[PDB]
């Protein structure tokens, strides 16, 4: 992907955001903004310019699944890559994220390799 690709990292705790932001930096992506929940995330996405969303599941105001679903139903964001990074690992939830159109799913705690791997596969699709 283009190194100027703009990312939105959504989590209600800074730890995940820092980890993800730093791994993104290691891969060469510095254009990264953060949000603290689904609503906060939607306010920034509506501002436009975003090219990739990575977000937690358990968050107040609007969780990750609901965020994913609104993004997928929005004519201006419907194809936005949405990679879930969350501690949530129960099967019924994994299946739900998949049925709602999640672009990928990484379980917390995750290694640097796992994130780069998942990210790169989504990136390949963005190129075709």
């Amino acid at each position: 992907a283009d190194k100027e690709l703009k990312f939105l990292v959504v989590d209600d705790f800074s730890t995940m955001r820092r980890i993800v932001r730093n791994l993104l930096k290691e891969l060469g992506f510095n254009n990264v903004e953060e949000a603290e929940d689904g609503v906060d995330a939607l306010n920034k996405l509506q501002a436009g310019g975003y090219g990739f969303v990575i977000s937690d599941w358990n968050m107040p105001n609007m969780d990750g699944l609901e965020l994913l679903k609104t993004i997928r139903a929005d004519g201006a964001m419907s194809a936005l890559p949405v990679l879930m990074v969350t501690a949530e690992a129960k099967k019924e939830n994994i299946i739900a994220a998949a049925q709602a159109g999640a672009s990928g799913y990484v379980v917390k705690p995750f290694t640097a390799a796992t994130l780069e791997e998942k990210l790169n596969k989504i990136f390949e699709k963005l190129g075709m």
Binding site: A89, K90, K91, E92, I94, I95, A97, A98, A102, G104, Y105, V106, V107, F110, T114, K118, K121
Partner: peptide
């Protein structure tokens, strides 16, 4: 009864 938890590999099968 216990939960149905999926590993990262099982998750990769349908999401990654």
């Amino acid at each position: 009864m216990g939960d149905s938890i999926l590993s990262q590999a099982e998750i990769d099968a349908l999401l990654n």
